[PDB]
Amino acid sequence: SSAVDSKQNRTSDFDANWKFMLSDSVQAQDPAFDDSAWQQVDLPHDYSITQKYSQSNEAESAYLPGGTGWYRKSFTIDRDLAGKRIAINFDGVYMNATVWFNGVKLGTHPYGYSPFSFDLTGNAKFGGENTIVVKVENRLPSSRWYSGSGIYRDVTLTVTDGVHVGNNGVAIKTPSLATQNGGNVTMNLTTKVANDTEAAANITLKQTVFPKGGKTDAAIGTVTTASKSIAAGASADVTSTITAASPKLWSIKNPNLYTVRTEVLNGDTVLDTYD
Amino acid sequence: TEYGFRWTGFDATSGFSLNGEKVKLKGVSMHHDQGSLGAVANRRAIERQVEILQKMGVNSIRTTHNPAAKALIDVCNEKGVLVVEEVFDMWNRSKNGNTEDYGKWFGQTIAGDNAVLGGDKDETWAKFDLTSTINRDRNAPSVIMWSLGNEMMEGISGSVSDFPATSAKLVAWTKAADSTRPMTYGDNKIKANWNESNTMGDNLTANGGVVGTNYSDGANYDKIRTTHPSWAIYGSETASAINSRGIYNRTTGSDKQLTSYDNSAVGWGAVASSAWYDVVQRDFVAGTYVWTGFDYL
Ligand code: NA
C-alpha cells in the first residue's frame, strides 16, 4: 500500500513500496529517520542473494553472508478507518525480527520460517502518516543449508470491525466422513470470536459452505448459531455444526475445494466476514 | 410584517423535512462581503449571489459566522432558499490573537444610560445581540434554524471548562425568544470526542435542537450516530476544498494559485466529491453546508 482505507479487502497485499538498508550500525526505528538514500524494494525480498560469495563464509550455506537488514514503510491510514482494528501479518522473516510502529517497539520473533503477526491498532495514527519498521538479524552461522535473509515471504494487512473472528480463528472437523461419504456429512466447527468494543455483543454466526469461486447460491450447507453474549474485551470459542449435503471429495486426481464463510452478526447486522 | 406558512422537522434517523416532505439540505456557507464592492450589502449584489447559487442546485445558506443583512433574508424569502442564521463566531474568548473581536464584548454588561434598542439589555451583549437578530427575523419563512456559534473552542487560549454552561445559557435565551425554530451550532470538536462537546450536544437535543458537526467524514458521522442515538445531526461545515478558477497544468494541490481539479483540500477537510459522497449515502445526515459557496476577502 501507499495508503490504507476502506474498502480494501479484509486482508490485503502489503508487499509494495518498502525501503531497505543493510547496516549493523544504523538505528532507524524513528518515523522521522531520513531514509532518502535507501533502496526502494517490493517484497518478498532476500538480501543474501544480492551479496557476493566469499571464502570467509561457509560452504554449508552457499558461501553467502547474512547480516543486519532494516525495512521501512511509510503509509497513510485514512480517517475512514478510525474505529477499525489493524494488524500486519508476516508469513516469514529470516530471522530474529524486531518490529516497531510509529516509534513504539512491538516485539520480536527468532524463527526464520514460522508465520507471525502484530496488532497495530493501539499505535496507529488514523488520518495520518504511519511508519512500520522491521529490523532483521541473520547473524551467521544459523543454517545447515542456504537460508537467505529478510522478508522473503508475503506481507499483508488485516482490517476488521471491533467485533471479529480471531486470527486463524476457524477450526473444522469431519470425524465421520468415511462413513457419511456421499450423504449428509457432519462438520463440527469451532470459531473464536473477539469483542474488542466497549459494550457486550449479542452474537450469532452465519456459516456457509460453498464451492471455491463460487457463490453462496451454490452452498451445500449452512447454519445459524443461537445468540451468545460475548462481553466487551472478551472472546469466546463458538461451536457450531454444519450438515454438508454430499460434498465432493478432495482427491489427488480431483482436488475439489470449498470456501467456508463465517459472517459475524451483532444485533441484526453483519460486522465481519471470514473465509 | 412579511410572512409565509411552513413547518419543518429534523429526525435523528431520516434527516430533514419541509412541509412533510423529506428534503436534503444542499447548502453552502456564505460570508457577508460582496467581492469588489467590499462589505457593502447591496441588494442586487446579494440577490445575484443567491441566483448563481440556485443555478448550482443550492437550497440552503448558512450565514457564517454572523447575522445576515436584512436584504439576504428578504431575497431568500422571495426565492425559496432555506437559511440557517448564525449569530456568533466566538463566544466569550477571542480567536486567532484577535484582541478586539466580539470575544471581548460577548460577556460585558450594558450601561444603564446606553439607549441602544433592538433586544434585551438586562444581562450581557450576547443576549442583546442574539435577541435583536431574532426579533428582526422571527417571522421570515426562509429562516429555519438559529445557529449560536461556530467552533467556539477553536483558536482560543485557556480552559474550555466554562463552555458547556455558556452554551446552555444561549440555548435557554433562544428558546425563550422564539419557540418555533430549532437552535443549533457548528462544533468542530465533535470529531475529536471532547467531553465538553458531548455535554453541549446533549443539551442542544434536550431543548429541541439540532447538532452541527464541522468536518466529520463518513466514519465519524457513523460514530456520532452510534454514540449519540438521540442527536439529529448534519454537516454544519464541510469540504474546504481549495481551488483557483481556470488552472489546469497540475491536477494536485509559483503562480500563487491552485489547481481547478477537485484534488485539493485543507488538512482538516475533504475534496468536494468526498464530502458529498459521505453525506448523500446517509439519511441520518440531514445535509451539508460547504465551505464556501463564494470566495471571500
Ligand atoms: Na465574496
Side-chain angles (χ1 to χ4, degrees), chain A residues 3-4 8-51 53-197 199-201 203-214 216-227 229-267 269-275, chain B residues 1-77 79-168 170-297:
Chain A
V4 186
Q8 283 156 310
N9 304 324
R10 190 183 191 273
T11 293
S12 63
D13 179 48
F14 204 59
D15 278 348
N17 302 320
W18 287 77
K19 291 185 158 195
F20 172 75
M21 171 67 73
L22 180 69
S23 166
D24 57 30
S25 69
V26 69
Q27 303 291 319
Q29 69 264 56
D30 289 336
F33 181 89
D34 183 11
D35 54 13
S36 50
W38 290 24
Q39 315 174 24
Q40 284 169 282
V41 301
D42 298 336
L43 308 178
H45 175 240
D46 174 354
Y47 61 90
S48 289
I49 205 57
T50 57
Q51 306 187 60
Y53 299 107
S54 176
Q55 301 190 34
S56 295
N57 298 318
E58 302 192 344
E60 254 194 332
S61 44
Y63 299 112
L64 284 180
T68 295
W70 290 78
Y71 293 80
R72 289 174 46 94
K73 183 166 171 177
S74 289
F75 61 101
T76 42
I77 296 176
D78 193 275
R79 279 173 69 199
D80 76 324
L81 293 181
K84 303 280 158 280
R85 316 275 309 161
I86 298 172
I88 181 171
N89 315 284
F90 299 96
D91 198 40
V93 181
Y94 197 102
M95 59 182 286
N96 291 315
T98 306
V99 177
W100 295 258
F101 190 43
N102 294 332
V104 184
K105 185 177 164 178
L106 299 193
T108 55
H109 186 260
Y111 202 29
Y113 300 114
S114 52
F116 55 102
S117 275
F118 283 97
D119 186 17
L120 294 184
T121 302
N123 287 296
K125 301 168 178 289
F126 297 90
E129 183 180 3
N130 296 265
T131 312
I132 184 95
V133 182
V134 189
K135 179 182 189 189
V136 180
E137 295 176 82
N138 185 10
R139 187 179 177 94
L140 267 47
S142 64
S143 183
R144 294 200 292 112
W145 57 86
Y146 173 85
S147 71
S149 310
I151 313 185
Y152 69 97
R153 299 176 172 166
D154 287 329
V155 179
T156 66
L157 281 197
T158 290
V159 174
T160 75
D161 194 277
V163 183
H164 62 94
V165 173
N167 184 35
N168 295 316
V170 174
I172 305 155
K173 303 184 176 179
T174 51
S176 306
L177 173 58
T179 295
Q180 293 175 321
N181 184 30
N184 287 336
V185 172
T186 302
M187 316 171 67
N188 296 132
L189 279 64
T190 307
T191 298
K192 190 166 296 290
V193 182
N195 177 7
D196 291 314
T197 79
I203 281 162
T204 58
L205 302 182
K206 177 167 177 37
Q207 289 161 324
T208 303
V209 182
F210 64 88
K212 181 180 182 188
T216 57
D217 68 299
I220 59 162
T222 67
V223 69
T224 303
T225 56
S227 201
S229 185
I230 300 179
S235 66
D237 286 310
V238 181
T239 67
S240 64
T241 302
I242 294 171
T243 296
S246 298
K248 297 174 184 169
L249 291 181
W250 186 97
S251 64
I252 294 176
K253 215 96 187 63
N254 193 4
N256 294 289
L257 286 174
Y258 290 88
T259 300
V260 181
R261 170 161 298 162
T262 297
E263 298 180 293
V264 190
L265 295 99
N266 180 28
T269 57
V270 168
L271 305 179
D272 191 44
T273 301
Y274 180 86
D275 296 342
Chain B
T1 181
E2 185 171 85
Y3 191 72
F5 294 85
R6 60 93 185 107
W7 76 99
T8 68
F10 288 85
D11 188 80
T13 306
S14 68
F16 172 80
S17 53
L18 181 57
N19 305 336
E21 313 180 355
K22 288 186 186 73
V23 164
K24 208 65 169 180
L25 291 172
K26 298 180 246 187
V28 296
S29 306
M30 294 288 290
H31 266 295
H32 75 286
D33 72 62
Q34 299 306 314
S36 67
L37 306 180
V40 169
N42 176 279
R43 197 202 190 270
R44 173 56 193 157
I46 284 180
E47 172 183 69
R48 166 169 183 271
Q49 276 183 341
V50 174
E51 293 179 352
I52 299 179
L53 285 175
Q54 282 179 305
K55 179 60 88 170
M56 196 201 315
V58 180
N59 64 11
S60 194
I61 294 176
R62 178 180 181 233
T63 76
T64 52
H65 297 288
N66 51 270
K70 185 60 193 194
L72 180 54
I73 301 303
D74 279 6
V75 158
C76 290
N77 273 6
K79 303 276 181 168
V81 170
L82 304 179
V83 174
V84 175
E85 191 166 27
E86 194 146 85
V87 177
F88 296 126
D89 181 34
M90 74 299 296
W91 287 348
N92 55 312
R93 294 270 254 275
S94 291
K95 308 173 149 191
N96 295 20
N98 298 346
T99 57
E100 300 283 339
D101 68 15
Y102 186 69
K104 171 183 182 187
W105 299 91
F106 181 100
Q108 290 195 35
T109 66
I110 303 169
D113 62 327
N114 186 348
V116 64
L117 302 176
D120 299 326
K121 305 150 72 160
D122 57 325
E123 305 199 48
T124 56
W125 280 114
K127 190 182 180 195
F128 177 92
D129 293 315
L130 167 61
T131 51
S132 191
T133 309
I134 294 172
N135 282 351
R136 198 197 58 196
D137 300 339
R138 68 165 72 260
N139 290 326
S142 62
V143 174
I144 60 165
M145 287 194 297
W146 314 104
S147 191
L148 304 179
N150 174 80
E151 302 190 351
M152 302 78 67
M153 300 183 274
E154 182 73 32
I156 68 175
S157 316
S159 171
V160 292
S161 291
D162 83 308
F163 272 90
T166 299
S167 184
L170 288 165
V171 168
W173 284 344
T174 300
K175 193 166 66 54
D178 167 31
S179 67
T180 69
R181 290 179 182 79
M183 75 290 300
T184 181
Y185 48 58
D187 191 354
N188 72 318
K189 298 296 185 181
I190 295 172
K191 53 194 289 190
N193 194 45
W194 280 20
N195 284 341
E196 289 76 13
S197 297
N198 295 327
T199 302
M200 285 170 51
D202 282 335
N203 168 261
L204 261 187
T205 302
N207 285 272
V210 182
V211 184
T213 179
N214 285 21
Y215 300 115
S216 287
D217 66 331
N220 196 243
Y221 286 131
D222 288 347
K223 186 178 170 181
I224 294 172
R225 182 71 174 118
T226 289
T227 312
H228 310 274
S230 71
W231 289 7
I233 71 172
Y234 65 108
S236 44
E237 208 177 305
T238 56
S240 269
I242 35 177
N243 296 111
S244 303
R245 176 173 55 74
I247 295 292
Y248 308 105
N249 51 14
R250 49 224 188 270
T251 61
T252 59
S254 325
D255 46 18
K256 302 169 179 189
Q257 309 284 355
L258 293 179
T259 182
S260 293
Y261 291 84
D262 183 41
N263 294 121
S264 165
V266 301
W268 53 96
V271 297
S273 57
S274 181
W276 179 233
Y277 191 65
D278 280 359
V279 169
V280 63
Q281 287 186 293
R282 292 164 173 86
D283 298 338
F284 70 90
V285 185
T288 177
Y289 291 89
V290 179
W291 190 269
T292 56
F294 268 60
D295 269 337
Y296 52 101
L297 292 158

